[PDB]
Amino acid sequence: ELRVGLEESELWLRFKELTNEMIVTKNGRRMFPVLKVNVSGLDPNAMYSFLLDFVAADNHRWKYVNGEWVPGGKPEPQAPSCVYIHPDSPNFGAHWMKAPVSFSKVKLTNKLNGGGQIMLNSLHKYEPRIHIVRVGDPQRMITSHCFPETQFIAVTAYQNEEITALKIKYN
Numbered sequence: 001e002l003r004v005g006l007e008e009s010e011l012w013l014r015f016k017e018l019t020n021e022m023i024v025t026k027n028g029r030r031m032f033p034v035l036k037v038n039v040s041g042l043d044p045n046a047m048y049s050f051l052l053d054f055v056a057a058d059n060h061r062w063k064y065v066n067g068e069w070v071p072g073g074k075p076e077p078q079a080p081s082c083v084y085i086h087p088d089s090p091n092f093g094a095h096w097m098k099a100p101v102s103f104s105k106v107k108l109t110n111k112l113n114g115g116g117q118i119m120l121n122s123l124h125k126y127e128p129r130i131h132i133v134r135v136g137d138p139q140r141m142i143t144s145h146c147f148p149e150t151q152f153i154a155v156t157a158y159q160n161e162e163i164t165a166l167k168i169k170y171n
């Protein structure tokens with residue numbers, strides 16, 4: 001069976017218990033923690049690309065009020081479709097399965113300023129999603145995988161000082 005497992009799930013859960021936050025900037029900011037997954041059950045002989053996108057979690061935005069995240073208003077129109085292609089793509093099943101797949105270079109932004117960045121709306125919640133795309137396939141068969149442990153709110157600045165401290169502790 002195809003199995004995609006989240007790496008460092010206990011680390012993600014430490015951030016999720018606080019409500020995770022990722023900084024967005026004009027020029028784009030890398031994530032901490034980094035999304036990394038282990039993969040088994042691909043065809044080692046076949047070629048695949050790995051894609052990452054971010055799914056909006058809510059029909060509303062969020063606000064940090066008195067140390068609590070609470071619903072913060074109606075949402076902005078959805079961010080444009082942004083897909084990140086894992087730079088090892090395309091590659092053999094054997095390549096993807098031999099070591100965890102790390103999305104360490106993806107950049108989150110709040111301005112369409114190019115550079116293969118992901119545009120996100122500030123104070124909106126997102127959930128990372130990985131797609132495995134088989135190459136040379138007439139059926140164009142693509143598997144998707146959500147990681148609920150990795151949900152976060154996009155912010156221009158950290159709201160929760162416990163998140164600021166965690167980011168420094170573990171990074």
Ligand SMILES: Nc1cccc(OCc2ccccc2)c1
Nearest residue numbers: 001002003041042043141142143
């Ligand atoms: N791509 C793939 C390869 C081998 C087994 C496989 O499991 C069948 C399946 C699992 C989960 C959702 C839908 C279908 C999927």
